[PDB]
Design a protein around this motif. Structure first.
Motif, PDB file in Angstrom:
ATOM      1  N   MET A  31       0.826  -1.206   0.000  1.00 52.90           N
ATOM      2  CA  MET A  31       0.000   0.000   0.000  1.00 52.90           C
ATOM      3  C   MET A  31       0.867   1.267   0.000  1.00 52.90           C
ATOM      4  SD  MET A  31      -3.473  -0.868   0.279  1.00 52.90           S
ATOM      5  CE  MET A  31      -4.351   0.150   1.456  1.00 52.90           C
ATOM      6  N   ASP A  32       1.553   1.525   1.114  1.00 55.05           N
ATOM      7  CA  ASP A  32       2.336   2.756   1.280  1.00 55.05           C
ATOM      8  C   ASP A  32       3.765   2.556   0.791  1.00 55.05           C
ATOM      9  OD1 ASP A  32       2.906   5.378   1.960  1.00 55.05           O
ATOM     10  OD2 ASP A  32       2.881   5.054   4.123  1.00 55.05           O
ATOM     11  N   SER A  33       4.241   3.476  -0.047  1.00 48.35           N
ATOM     12  CA  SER A  33       5.613   3.442  -0.566  1.00 48.35           C
ATOM     13  C   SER A  33       6.648   3.574   0.549  1.00 48.35           C
ATOM     14  CB  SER A  33       5.828   4.554  -1.594  1.00 48.35           C
ATOM     15  OG  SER A  33       4.984   4.385  -2.717  1.00 48.35           O
ATOM     16  N   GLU A  94       3.552  -3.481   9.485  1.00 46.85           N
ATOM     17  CA  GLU A  94       4.248  -2.626  10.456  1.00 46.85           C
ATOM     18  C   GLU A  94       5.407  -1.894   9.772  1.00 46.85           C
ATOM     19  OE1 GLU A  94       4.851  -4.555  14.214  1.00 46.85           O
ATOM     20  OE2 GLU A  94       6.390  -3.136  14.844  1.00 46.85           O
ATOM     21  N   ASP A  95       5.614  -0.622  10.125  1.00 42.17           N
ATOM     22  CA  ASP A  95       6.516   0.279   9.376  1.00 42.17           C
ATOM     23  C   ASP A  95       7.879   0.524  10.034  1.00 42.17           C
ATOM     24  OD1 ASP A  95       4.700   0.460   7.354  1.00 42.17           O
ATOM     25  OD2 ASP A  95       4.082   2.529   7.788  1.00 42.17           O
ATOM     26  N   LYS A  96       8.678   1.408   9.420  1.00 41.33           N
ATOM     27  CA  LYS A  96      10.040   1.747   9.881  1.00 41.33           C
ATOM     28  C   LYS A  96      10.116   1.994  11.381  1.00 41.33           C
ATOM     29  CE  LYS A  96       9.499   4.972   6.990  1.00 41.33           C
ATOM     30  NZ  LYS A  96       9.576   6.334   6.390  1.00 41.33           N
ATOM     31  N   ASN A 100       1.335   0.901  12.395  1.00 44.27           N
ATOM     32  CA  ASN A 100       0.730  -0.187  11.643  1.00 44.27           C
ATOM     33  C   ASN A 100      -0.080   0.347  10.476  1.00 44.27           C
ATOM     34  OD1 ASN A 100       1.604  -2.016  13.813  1.00 44.27           O
ATOM     35  ND2 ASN A 100      -0.092  -1.106  14.984  1.00 44.27           N
ATOM     36  N   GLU A 101      -0.046  -0.365   9.352  1.00 41.19           N
ATOM     37  CA  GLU A 101      -0.909  -0.051   8.221  1.00 41.19           C
ATOM     38  C   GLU A 101      -1.885  -1.196   7.935  1.00 41.19           C
ATOM     39  OE1 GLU A 101       0.932   0.722   4.443  1.00 41.19           O
ATOM     40  OE2 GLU A 101      -0.857   1.759   3.683  1.00 41.19           O
ATOM     41  N   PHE A 102      -3.175  -0.863   7.938  1.00 42.80           N
ATOM     42  CA  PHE A 102      -4.263  -1.800   7.649  1.00 42.80           C
ATOM     43  C   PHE A 102      -4.289  -2.187   6.167  1.00 42.80           C
ATOM     44  CE2 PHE A 102      -8.770  -2.199   6.272  1.00 42.80           C
ATOM     45  CZ  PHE A 102      -9.101  -3.348   6.964  1.00 42.80           C
TER      46      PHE A 102
HETATM   47 CA   LIG Z   1       2.365   3.189   6.179  1.00 45.26          CA
END
Ligand SMILES: [Ca+2]
Length: 128
Positions: A31-33, A94-96, A100-102
């Motif tokens: 989803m997120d770059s 889970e990010d850097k 959290n991203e759904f």
């Molecule tokens: Ca994200």
């Protein structure tokens, strides 16, 4: 095209226990770059008073096809609870940092589960 989640459920009626094995996922949508491909699964028993109704598997690193192979157990689950509650399962990246991203979710109405009989699932994820 959010991917699909494979898991098995078992209501051990005599031990008031709902065993949820989260097996794997396939083609989990990035989803997120800035986001990472570090996915995990979030189990939530609804309706419910939080915290004790909320379970989580480990977190895999750099994978779009994660294989958790992990059994999460809810103790103190009665027949009235199998009649009442619903199990929401959601896959999160889970990010850097720690955020959290759904990605997607699914719900399993516990009414449909028969006692002592295992039930395997493989269903595509959703945004609701
Ligand atoms: Ca994200």
């Amino acid at each position: 095209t959010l991917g699909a989640l494979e898991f098995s459920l078992l209501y051990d009626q005599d031990n008031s226990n709902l065993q949820c094995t989260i097996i794997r996922a396939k083609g989990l949508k990035p989803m997120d770059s800035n986001g990472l491909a570090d996915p995990y699964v979030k189990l939530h028993l609804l309706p419910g008073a939080s915290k004790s109704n909320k379970l989580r598997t480990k977190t895999l690193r750099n994978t779009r096809n994660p294989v958790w192979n992990e059994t999460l157990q809810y103790h103190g689950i009665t027949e009235e609870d199998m009649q009442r509650k619903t199990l929401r399962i959601s896959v999160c990246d889970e990010d850097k940092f720690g955020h959290n991203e759904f990605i997607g979710e699914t719900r399993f109405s516990l009414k449909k589960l028969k006692a002592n009989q295992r039930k395997n699932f493989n269903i595509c994820l959703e945004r609701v």
